[PDB]
Amino acid sequence: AVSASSRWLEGIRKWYYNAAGFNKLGLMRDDTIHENDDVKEAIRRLPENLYDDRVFRIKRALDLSMRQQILPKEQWTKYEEDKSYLEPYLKEVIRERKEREEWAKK
Amino acid sequence: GRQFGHLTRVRHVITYSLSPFEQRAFPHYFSKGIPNVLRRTRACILRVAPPFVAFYLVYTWGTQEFEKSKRKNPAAYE
Amino acid sequence: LTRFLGPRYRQLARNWVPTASLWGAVGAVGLVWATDWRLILDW
Amino acid sequence: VAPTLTARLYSLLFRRTSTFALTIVVGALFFERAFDQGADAIYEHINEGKLWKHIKHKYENK
Amino acid sequence: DPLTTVREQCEQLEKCVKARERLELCDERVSSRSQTEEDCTEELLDFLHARDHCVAHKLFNSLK
Amino acid sequence: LHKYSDIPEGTECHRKAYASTSIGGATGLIVSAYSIALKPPASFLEGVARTGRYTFTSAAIGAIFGLTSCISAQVREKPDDPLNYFIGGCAGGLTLGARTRSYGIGAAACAYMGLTAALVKMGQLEGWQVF
Amino acid sequence: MTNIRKSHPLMKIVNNAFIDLPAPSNISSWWNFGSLLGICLILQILTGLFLAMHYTSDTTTAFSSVTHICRDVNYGWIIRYMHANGASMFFICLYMHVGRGLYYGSYTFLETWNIGVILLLTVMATAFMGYVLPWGQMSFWGATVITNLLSAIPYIGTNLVEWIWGGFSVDKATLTRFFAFHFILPFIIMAIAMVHLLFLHETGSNNPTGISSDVDKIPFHPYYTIKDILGALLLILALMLLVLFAPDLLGDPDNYTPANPLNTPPHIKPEWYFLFAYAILRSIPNKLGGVLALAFSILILALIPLLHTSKQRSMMFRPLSQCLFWALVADLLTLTWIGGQPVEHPYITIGQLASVLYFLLILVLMPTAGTIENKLLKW
Amino acid sequence: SDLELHPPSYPWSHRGLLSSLDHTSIRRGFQVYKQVCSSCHSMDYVAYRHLVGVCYTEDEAKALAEEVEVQDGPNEDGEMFMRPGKLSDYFPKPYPNPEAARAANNGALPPDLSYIVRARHGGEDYVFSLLTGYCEPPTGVSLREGLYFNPYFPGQAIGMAPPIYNEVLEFDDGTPATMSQVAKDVCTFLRWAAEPEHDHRKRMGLKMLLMMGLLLPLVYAMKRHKWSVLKSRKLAYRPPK
Numbered sequence A: 001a002v003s004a005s006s007r008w009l010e011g012i013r014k015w016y017y018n019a020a021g022f023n024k025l026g027l028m029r030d031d032t033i034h035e036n037d038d039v040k041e042a043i044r045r046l047p048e049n050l051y052d053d054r055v056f057r058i059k060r061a062l063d064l065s066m067r068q069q070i071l072p073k074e075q076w077t078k079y080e081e082d083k084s085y086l087e088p089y090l091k092e093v094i095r096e097r098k099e100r101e102e103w104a105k106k
Numbered sequence B: 001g002r003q004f005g006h007l008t009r010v011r012h013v014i015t016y017s018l019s020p021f022e023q024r025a026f027p028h029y030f031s032k033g034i035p036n037v038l039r040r041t042r043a044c045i046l047r048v049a050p051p052f053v054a055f056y057l058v059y060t061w062g063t064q065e066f067e068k069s070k071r072k073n074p075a076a077y078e
Numbered sequence C: 001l002t003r004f005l006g007p008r009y010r011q012l013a014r015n016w017v018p019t020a021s022l023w024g025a026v027g028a029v030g031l032v033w034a035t036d037w038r039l040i041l042d043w
Numbered sequence D: 001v002a003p004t005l006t007a008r009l010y011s012l013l014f015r016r017t018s019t020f021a022l023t024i025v026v027g028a029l030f031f032e033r034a035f036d037q038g039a040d041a042i043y044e045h046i047n048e049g050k051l052w053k054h055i056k057h058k059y060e061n062k
Numbered sequence E: 001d002p003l004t005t006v007r008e009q010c011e012q013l014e015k016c017v018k019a020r021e022r023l024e025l026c027d028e029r030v031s032s033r034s035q036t037e038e039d040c041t042e043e044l045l046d047f048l049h050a051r052d053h054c055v056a057h058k059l060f061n062s063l064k
Numbered sequence F: 001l002h003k004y005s006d007i008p009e010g011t012e013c014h015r016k017a018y019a020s021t022s023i024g025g026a027t028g029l030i031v032s033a034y035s036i037a038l039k040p041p042a043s044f045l046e047g048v049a050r051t052g053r054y055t056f057t058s059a060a061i062g063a064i065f066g067l068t069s070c071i072s073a074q075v076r077e078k079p080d081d082p083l084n085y086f087i088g089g090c091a092g093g094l095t096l097g098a099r100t101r102s103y104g105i106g107a108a109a110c111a112y113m114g115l116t117a118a119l120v121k122m123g124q125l126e127g128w129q130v131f
Numbered sequence G: 001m002t003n004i005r006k007s008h009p010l011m012k013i014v015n016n017a018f019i020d021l022p023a024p025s026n027i028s029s030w031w032n033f034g035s036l037l038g039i040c041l042i043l044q045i046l047t048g049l050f051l052a053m054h055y056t057s058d059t060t061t062a063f064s065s066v067t068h069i070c071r072d073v074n075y076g077w078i079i080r081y082m083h084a085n086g087a088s089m090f091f092i093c094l095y096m097h098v099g100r101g102l103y104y105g106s107y108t109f110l111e112t113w114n115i116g117v118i119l120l121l122t123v124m125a126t127a128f129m130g131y132v133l134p135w136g137q138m139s140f141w142g143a144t145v146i147t148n149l150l151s152a153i154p155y156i157g158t159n160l161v162e163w164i165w166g167g168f169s170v171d172k173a174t175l176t177r178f179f180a181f182h183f184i185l186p187f188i189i190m191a192i193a194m195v196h197l198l199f200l201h202e203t204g205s206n207n208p209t210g211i212s213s214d215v216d217k218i219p220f221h222p223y224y225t226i227k228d229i230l231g232a233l234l235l236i237l238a239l240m241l242l243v244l245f246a247p248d249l250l251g252d253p254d255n256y257t258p259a260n261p262l263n264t265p266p267h268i269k270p271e272w273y274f275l276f277a278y279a280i281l282r283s284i285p286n287k288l289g290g291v292l293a294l295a296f297s298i299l300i301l302a303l304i305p306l307l308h309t310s311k312q313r314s315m316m317f318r319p320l321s322q323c324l325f326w327a328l329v330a331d332l333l334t335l336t337w338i339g340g341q342p343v344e345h346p347y348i349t350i351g352q353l354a355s356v357l358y359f360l361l362i363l364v365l366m367p368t369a370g371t372i373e374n375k376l377l378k379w
Numbered sequence H: 001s002d003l004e005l006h007p008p009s010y011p012w013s014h015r016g017l018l019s020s021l022d023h024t025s026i027r028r029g030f031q032v033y034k035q036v037c038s039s040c041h042s043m044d045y046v047a048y049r050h051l052v053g054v055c056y057t058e059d060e061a062k063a064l065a066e067e068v069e070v071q072d073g074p075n076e077d078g079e080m081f082m083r084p085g086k087l088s089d090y091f092p093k094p095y096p097n098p099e100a101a102r103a104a105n106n107g108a109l110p111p112d113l114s115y116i117v118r119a120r121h122g123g124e125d126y127v128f129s130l131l132t133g134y135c136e137p138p139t140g141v142s143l144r145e146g147l148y149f150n151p152y153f154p155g156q157a158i159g160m161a162p163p164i165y166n167e168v169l170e171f172d173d174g175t176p177a178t179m180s181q182v183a184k185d186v187c188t189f190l191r192w193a194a195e196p197e198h199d200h201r202k203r204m205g206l207k208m209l210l211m212m213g214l215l216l217p218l219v220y221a222m223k224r225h226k227w228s229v230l231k232s233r234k235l236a237y238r239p240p241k
């Protein structure tokens, strides 16, 4: 029964993403992920393009952090462009491990 | 067991750097610094602003109230 | 001992003396502050 | 043309680390003395007559 | 000699006059209703503070 | 206002600052009220966003003004001269300067809000009748 | 290899954890507290060994001894005040260290965070014992009240407090014990610090962004050795600024009074580094409840790794947690204030709320905020 | 639970970072302690080492320290046959041992002034405002004779006889001995016995401050030069794609 709420929920989301340093940094939500064992395997599964891209964006990022400068207003990450490119990969990895765990019950 | 040749894989990234003796330690430091320092501080102040305000307000109230109870007692009972 | 000695080595020794010579001067300066010889102070 | 002060300094004293350190040793000496002298004086100025150095007169040799 | 004068002066300022009224009533309230647990000490504690802040700054230029 | 008026002097800075916060909040609700009245926000959530804006801003201005004023009173311990409010006056604009994210409006607000406050204190000292 | 000094000696290779090691590029100034933390341990150590070159550990003398160290001994005055002030630094620095891994997800390094925690609580014991060595009013009574706080344990407690003290009170017995333990804890601590560094050298240092920097790694020697030296420069500045211009300022306690066991400063309290714990302890009516709660304040730290809810080990990109993070530090500041406060209504009621707000922020608020943020990002 | 009044930041030559002690003050004060205070309060960690610290010569203080050993001498310390001469002897204990000391003052125990300044909360200000602070008991108040009322004592009562009163003593030079003028001098000598090293230390601090600025600035420059390369480098991605 979410009509007004969905739009309202969507509105809240843009502000957090815009508000977040990640949008300012230019590294997409997916590059901000805590690199753990599942993320790690999803990462490894990335295409050269996808994958090399993450390396540059984090490269450019950690470079800005080091210098304390923000990227120009023109070049920022816009919420409407949520590449959840990790998501796909990341999902399965978890999917596969959940299964494995479950198969080990008895 | 090697930390430099084994960190990660990076393709297609070019980096350009200059030698210490060719540049200045600070290039337009006053101009660059005021903006970045000012811009960063405002965001930082806002996020950490809430913690600071509460502490100051509570400290003032506590000192006053503790002092206040101690300050007058004779007038109340006679 | 014998192996270390050589006809060829002399340039290094000469170079070492200056760096060594420069190094030697520093100790005198370093020692002197701690030593505080009145004569050293007089110098 | 001449070398900037620094370039002169450089080529005389800082190419060879032997000379560089020599310098520093020398410098550390010379520096200590002037600092003290200057630093001391500054401090004594700020407490004129408050310190024994100033006051020894009163009871000294009659 | 020195101390004693400057103290007085200090209690001659409009804020010392003003807050000495609490001491005056104190003292009388307490002396008349002597059995009460009322402390005149606590009343004095405000006067003294204001007298002494003053004293300090002036009293110092008077000594050796 | 009668509540805020019994400062006394500047003692207990919080007690005062709460009152100034109250006045700032009141004026914020009024300004928000006419603003909503004369600039039909469209989509009511935006309207409460607006009123939240003004209310919080004016309340903030009142708070910071009040406490800087009383603190200056309890620190300089002058404490009665008009300049004692003026800092807070100057401070108030900066608060207003912060929310507007502009040096300009903050700068002007500093000066004029300062002079206004100074005139207010001067007026309490002189019994100026306004009405 | 031939004549590569570094790897020649095996021993010298071990030291190339300073010079050659992969170091993240981006890296707040906050990190300089690790290094600084170790400068503080070394400082304390040299100072301690020179103080303990002219100190005695007896009721009669101790006071005098310290008093003699500060008067007739040559440059023992600064050595001692450097010592005292140092430890303040040592703590100021430690709490920056913990804040940085509370913020940036450095605590992700479970192993390294549990050694940290051990480190922090070892350094706590050393500072607790060293403050009593002088044997001044504050010291005397502080060690009675704390130690006796242990007698809250129901079955043992009582016997145990008397074992620790080596008697029924705090006389000589106890004061020599503290001298011995104070001297040997920092040497045991040094091995733990090196065990700490060991683990941490297996995964490298985290960053502001919270993301792996293996794609951008810098030689420690070129860059970080200067940064560290510079950070020392400032560190010493603060130490000497303190120790040269305001010796006592940060050493709240004015009690330079030889301990008289019947006498009491109605205002009994640990130094600034312990206040938090103190305040949290007084909030509970019951003695035992307080001691457990005291422990948990500090011991609560190891639980944070489990508490982590978000997908971004970096707080950097998370508002709401940044907001509660800061509050908790300001709550912490609030609690330190209560520590030097008369234990009366005004402060009581405040402290109590503060104590719940601390545990909330750590145990319930943040965790939730973590989830929320994840759901806003659609994670 | 009685409000305690607190000391002014009384105008002191030394209040300031670079400000130092005024020995003439020290000197004067010393005599105040010695004549006004030696009688009940001790100073154990103070030896007869004013020499340079108080501008008393070594002959001057030797002499000064000789008579104190002739009258109070090591016969109170346990040197049966000791008289004038020695300089390593510390200021003479008013009484054989503390228990006595309370009897002479009826239960109270005259605190060693060595460290009073740094011991008791509030420094020289408190000490000055105590001595100089003595006002009339407050309407409706009772006072046992020993319990003189003092505006600045925690428990609002102290066992202290006329600490200092006008014309208590006389100084060599001629400094006008006012209750307060004397207390200004007494406090100062106390400040010094509390922190003799600190007065010397303050000068080092001034040097340290000068040293720190040159050093702090220099360190930053070195850091920038070393850290300059990291900031300077350009990073870009160029795939054939």
Ligand code: HEC
Pocket (backbone or CB within 6 Å): H032, H033, H036, H037, H038, H039, H040, H041, H105, H108, H109, H110, H111, H113, H116, H120, H127, H130, H131, H157, H158, H159, H160, H161, H163, H164, H186
């Ligand atoms: C009777 C001899 C006597 C002399 C002379 C004397 N005092 Fe005292 N003083 C006492 C006694 C007794 C006490 C204890 C007060 C109490 O317990 O109420 C005391 C207490 C004090 C205190 C109170 C500190 C505290 O909070 O316990 C200070 C400060 C002090 N003396 C300093 C001085 C100084 C400085 C002088 C010299 C000007 C001086 N006194 C002269 C007897 C004396």
Ligand code: HEM
Pocket (backbone or CB within 6 Å): G040, G041, G044, G045, G046, G047, G048, G049, G051, G052, G053, G055, G066, G080, G083, G084, G087, G090, G123, G126, G127, G130, G131, G132, G133, G134, G182, G183, G186, G187
């Ligand atoms: C980092 C660990 C250490 C900490 C936190 C520490 C802290 C302290 C503190 C807080 C005091 C009380 C001083 C005062 O307020 O007067 C003290 C005193 C003392 N410490 Fe340490 N210390 C440490 C390491 C050491 C070491 C390694 C030694 C000896 C090797 C040592 C020897 C002493 C001695 C002998 C005293 C008594 C003299 C005095 O009071 O200064 N300490 N220490």
Ligand code: HEM
Pocket (backbone or CB within 6 Å): G030, G031, G032, G033, G034, G035, G037, G038, G041, G094, G097, G098, G101, G106, G107, G109, G112, G113, G115, G116, G117, G118, G119, G120, G123, G193, G196, G197, G200, G204, G205, G206, G207, G301
């Ligand atoms: C005696 C006290 C301590 C010393 C001497 C010390 C030393 C160091 C040093 C030199 C480093 C590397 C540089 C840096 O990251 O700052 C570091 C990192 C670290 N320390 Fe400490 N440490 C101490 C206490 C602690 C405490 C109390 C904790 C937490 C409970 C802790 C946890 C960590 C963690 C988690 C890191 C890695 C963070 C990262 O770089 O991503 N340490 N330590």
